[PDB]
């Protein structure tokens, strides 16, 4: 291998081979990508362009 | 450390090796004592 970074992706972690997990040499860390809280939801709406047609108050709302 | 690692597989002793080595490389500290417990639970 000598120089491969693996990134696996799943919406169904229950159905992952458990052997994949927590071995150095194959997926040493897992990261949960969760739903956004309010602050992140507001950050998203700003970079996405909601500001084109919404006031700062309508975005907060 | 051989004493404290009862019930470890060779694999887990290897996964312990990378961890203590990384801390030792990153920090200059190896907390074997701390990390066997972290691996048990």
From Swiss-Prot, chain B:
Top-rank taxon: Bacteria
Induction, as annotated: Expression is sigma W-dependent. Induced by alkali stress. Strongly induced at the end of the exponential growth phase.
Annotated localization: Cytoplasm
Functional summary from the UniProt entry: Shows ATPase activity.
Family, as annotated: Belongs to the AAA ATPase family.
The name this protein goes by in its record: Uncharacterized ATPase YjoB
Source organism: Bacillus subtilis (strain 168)
Residues of the full protein shown: 364 to 404 of 423
């Amino acid at each position: 291998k000598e120089g491969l970074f693996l990134i696996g992706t799943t919406n169904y972690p229950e159905e992952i081979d458990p052997g994949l997990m927590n071995r150095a040499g194959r997926f040493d860390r897992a990261y949960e990508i969760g739903l956004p809280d309010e602050e992140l939801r507001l950050e998203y709406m700003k970079m996405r362009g909601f500001g084109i047609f919404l006031s700062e108050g309508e975005i907060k709302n | 450390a051989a004493k404290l690692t009862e019930g470890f597989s060779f694999a887990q002793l290897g996964e312990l090796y990378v961890s203590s080595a990384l801390q030792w490389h990153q920090e200059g500290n190896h907390h074997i004592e701390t990390m066997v417990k972290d691996m048990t639970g």
